[PDB]
Write a protein that binds this ligand. Structure first.
Ligand SMILES: Cc1cc2nc3c(=O)[nH]c(=O)nc-3n(C[C@H](O)[C@H](O)[C@H](O)COP(=O)(O)OP(=O)(O)OC[C@H]3O[C@@H](n4cnc5c(N)ncnc54)[C@H](O)[C@@H]3O)c2cc1C
Ligand SMILES: Cc1cc2nc3c(=O)[nH]c(=O)nc-3n(C[C@H](O)[C@H](O)[C@H](O)COP(=O)(O)OP(=O)(O)OC[C@H]3O[C@@H](n4cnc5c(N)ncnc54)[C@H](O)[C@@H]3O)c2cc1C
Ligand SMILES: [Cl-]
Ligand SMILES: [Cl-]
Lengths: 511, 490
């Protein structure tokens, strides 16, 4: 009858997303205490989200009016992949549902007889808005419809049935500060101190966390949000961490924060991923500045050269700003939940920000935490269900990311030559063989949930260009009519939206 | 044009012929060869949640085909006496509702109003108990309801539909299937129409499997080690449906050595006894069925059937694809027979070999077909593993029989975790997570727990949703007409 006590260790994005979500879900029925270090800094990045993100704010009962201005937040409709196939060309991976004609996806029709040479513009409306720098909403908060006009879906069904599950760019520090206010206004205890030790009982479970100036803080469930450190799960409980470095070599990153005149430049409604000599560079647009970073493998490029490459790429306005060098831990823990300790965030695992899935992992974890929340005698099946769910999301996204590099047609430097000599898991090698003949569907991809629908695999395959696809033979005998009218309908609405929608700065100037 | 030759014309063949001709047409040539001495099986009266998409693909409105086939509506399947004598529950064609991330059945396990989950969580469960029509007397209406109909009448209707679009029809005996060098099919030899050749051959010859199983020697994987029901005896009983109404559902009444189906049609009921030989002989299986229906079924002829339970090792070999009973079959507990056909012909259009036969296309089709069979099979075993009835030797053996290691493990999860999208059969097999919920909750031999989180959650949003369902049901029952009144008007 006494409220279960949850102790959260870490004041990063993971920690406050957990505290606010847990407190919103259970209210005063659950006591939440968040302990964070005052000397240890947060990772400083993580500023683009995934198609899942809208569900998180809806669960928190937060409208865009309340949180977006305080975080310098902007809209994200897609990820623009630049120069991944050949110099000077780009394609979008949009957060938009794939339309089908007579049981066949529009991309399959596009392979038979597509209008233009860009699959993304023909099959996705969002690709036209991105190329025009358009805001998804008119000057009155009206989404893609001039006149005005919610939904109770879970996270998975949101990104599965919502036609336009767009995302956001935002400052990772401002969001954490906002969620700290959201949490503390709902009864979340805040303790700023260092956790010196994790005291375990006789049976190996966490008894309490030993702080320096606040004594022993105990509880029933301990949540590790200490980042790459893994203070509780990896260090204290000794849960082994498995690396993904063998399939995804990128281990390093260097990032800047560049204040720019977001007016002459404009605010592009997407994250850009420009392919480079030893990796790729991200461009995350915000209100007032852009967040840019070079994700690379240091075996192909020195940290010194990587920073200079990044500064040249942005230009003179980034010549003197501080550069943040990060050594990434790529992979995941063998299990994210052992005994009474569950890791959420960088402590659980991480893959390179190629598709901005970092915050997605956190969002998925806390949702699965509520779903598999213990209150009785802790049934092993509950913990097993959580660990398999979290691992499948990680393992699935990892396949999707390797596919980016196996599909890349770029082949100039040693880094991009080695991307095809590197050994892949046998599972993905077989699906690629299936995908060459049978364009990816719900039955030839990774079987368990991992946030990626078939049209995502379609977009990366069609856009990166090295893996040749074919249109299914049935479309050579089908009446192309209906498909050509669907192609026309997409082109028509796109032309209407581009000519009627405002830029983002215009939208954000109108409060 | 690509030449497709279909052997067999008993629902499997005509659904294939009409679907292909509507999908492609003129750019594909279809020839159907059916025996004029060998008949259809000839049952298959109830359908599944997929069936509406089939008629929509054929561009057929309900009024075009339903009266011609004596068709009625199927809102659910009523499982009777599977847990205890006199108790029943429904497995409806209605989406499960979610409150704060948890399915309504999970909330019901925590603090449900009534002792009947189906009445609390499903609206149509109230309509079934009240014998309501899903449509008003003026045609008004996610509810993927199915149909009951005469399989014989639908076959003739589709034949007309097929031949009205260029499907070449031949009535003759296929006496031989001649194989070329590779082992593919050159042509089939008829009795007096000569050889009929083509590029693709479709085996729809039923349990015989003349083309796939006999001519090409594709092995058959038996499911009888986990599903012993191998026999069936069926009747067609003309009735004054006005007196006792037309139920908007298929009933599955558990019996001493199996179960009995009751399929309501226009002017008659389709009913049969699915059973296992070791527990019941065909003669007393007939006796039981007649006593179950009554004096109205004392003189009507009885159709005895030896069922082949399982699936072919592969349904597509070389240039031959088997569709229907030739591909595989499981007992009609959930009416998945025509669903298997509808799925197969849809996969056939998807994996159509208009291109010069890539092995990956054939591999994809066989995987889709096999997993639907394996998934449904797992779902049907759950009916018997979950059934609390324990009176006869037949029902006691359902708890000592062999159980797939995969099933046994995810059952142990379901007892705690409850069926979701991540702990069921991971590939498409027509059954959503809420279908598994209904069977477990209804049959009652397998106990379940609510999620421990719901003990700490605010019930307000859930209690509101239960009330919203009961209110909508109360209104619908009071305003909707009988299913009989509906068809009597139209
Ligand atoms: C280069 C890089 C780029 C990224 N890009 C993206 C992106 O584009 N989109 C996206 O969604 N995600 C991205 N991510 C991931 C994202 O940044 C993280 O998931 C999130 O921002 C922070 O997760 P975290 O709190 O676990 O990490 P951290 O910021 O490291 O959290 C650590 C917290 O725990 C505290 N702490 C640590 N040890 C102790 C201790 N003994 N005692 C007390 N407190 C302690 C620390 O003080 C700190 O508050 C990126 C990550 C990196 C490294
Ligand atoms: C007891 C029982 C109950 C069932 N209940 C349901 C239900 O409730 N709901 C549902 O959806 N499905 C049900 N089914 C399945 C359903 O009956 C079938 O899916 C469908 O109705 C018939 O499939 P078929 O054409 O492959 O079989 P068949 O009817 O046997 O087709 C055989 C055809 O091929 C011809 N033929 C055979 N050999 C030759 C030859 N050498 N040469 C030329 N022609 C040949 C025959 O003349 C015949 O026309 C049930 C099946 C059984 C046995
Ligand atoms: Cl990321
Ligand atoms: Cl069936």
């Amino acid at each position: 009858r006494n409220p279960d006590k949850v102790v959260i260790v870490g004041g990063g994005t993971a920690g406050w997303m957990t505290a606010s979500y847990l407190k919103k879900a259970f209210g005063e029925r659950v006591s939440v205490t968040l302990v964070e270090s005052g000397t240890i800094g947060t990772v400083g990045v993580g500023e683009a989200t995934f198609s899942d993100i809208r569900h998180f704010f809806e669960f928190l009962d937060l409208r865009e009016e309340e949180w977006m201005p305080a975080c310098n937040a902007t809209y994200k409709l897609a990820v623009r992949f630049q120069d991944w196939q050949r110099p000077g060309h780009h394609f979008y991976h949009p957060f938009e549902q794939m339309r089908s004609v007579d049981g066949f996806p529009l991309t399959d029709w596009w392979l038979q007889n597509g209008p233009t040479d860009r699959f993304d513009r023909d099959c996705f409306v969002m690709a036209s808005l991105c190329d025009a720098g358009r805001s998804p909403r008119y000057l009155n908060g009206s989404l893609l419809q001039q006149e005005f006009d919610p939904a109770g879906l879970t996270m998975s069904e949101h990104q599965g049935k919502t036609q336009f599950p767009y995302a956001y760019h935002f400052e990772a520090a401002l969001l954490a500060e906002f969620l700290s206010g959201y949490s503390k206004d709902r009864g979340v205890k805040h303790v700023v101190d260092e956790v010196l030790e994790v005291k375990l009982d006789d049976r190996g479970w966490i008894s309490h966390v030993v702080t320096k100036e606040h004594g022993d803080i105990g509880g029933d469930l301990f949540v590790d949000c200490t980042g790459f450190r893994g203070v509780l799960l990896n260090q204290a409980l000794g849960v082994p961490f498995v690396s993904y470095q063998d399939t995804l070599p990128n281990d390093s990153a260097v990032a800047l924060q560049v204040p720019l005149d977001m007016e002459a430049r404009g605010i592009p409604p997407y994250t850009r991923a420009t392919a480079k000599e030893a990796g790729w560079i991200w461009t995350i647009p915000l209100i007032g500045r852009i967040g840019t970073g070079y994700v690379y493998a240091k075996d192909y490029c020195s940290p010194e050269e990587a920073e200079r490459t990044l500064r040249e790429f942005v230009g003179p306005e980034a010549a003197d700003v501080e550069a943040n060098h990060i050594r990434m831990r790529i992979g995941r823990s063998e299990q994210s939940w052992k005994n009474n300790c569950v890791a959420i965030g960088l402590s659980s695992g991480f893959v390179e920000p190629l598709e901005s899935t970092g915050i997605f992992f956190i969002h998925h974890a806390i949702e699965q935490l509520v779903k598999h929340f213990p209150a009785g005698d802790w049934h092993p099946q509950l913990r097993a269900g959580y660990n398999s769910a979290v691992a499948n999301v990680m393992d699935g996204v990892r396949e999707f990311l390797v596919l980016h590099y196996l599909g890349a047609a770029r082949n100039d430097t040693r880094y991009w030559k080695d991307t095809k000599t590197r050994a892949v898991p046998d599972a993905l090698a077989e699906r690629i063989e299936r995908w060459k003949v049978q364009l990816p569907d719900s039955e030839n991809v990774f079987p368990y949930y991992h946030g990626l629908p078939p049209y995502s695999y379609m977009a990366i395959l069609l856009g990166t260009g090295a893996i040749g696809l074919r249109p299914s033979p049935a479309l050579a005998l089908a009446d192309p009519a209906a498909a050509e009218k669907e192609f026309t309908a997409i082109r028509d609405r796109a032309r209407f939206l581009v000519d009627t929608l405002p830029s983002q700065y215009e939208y954000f100037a109108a409060m």
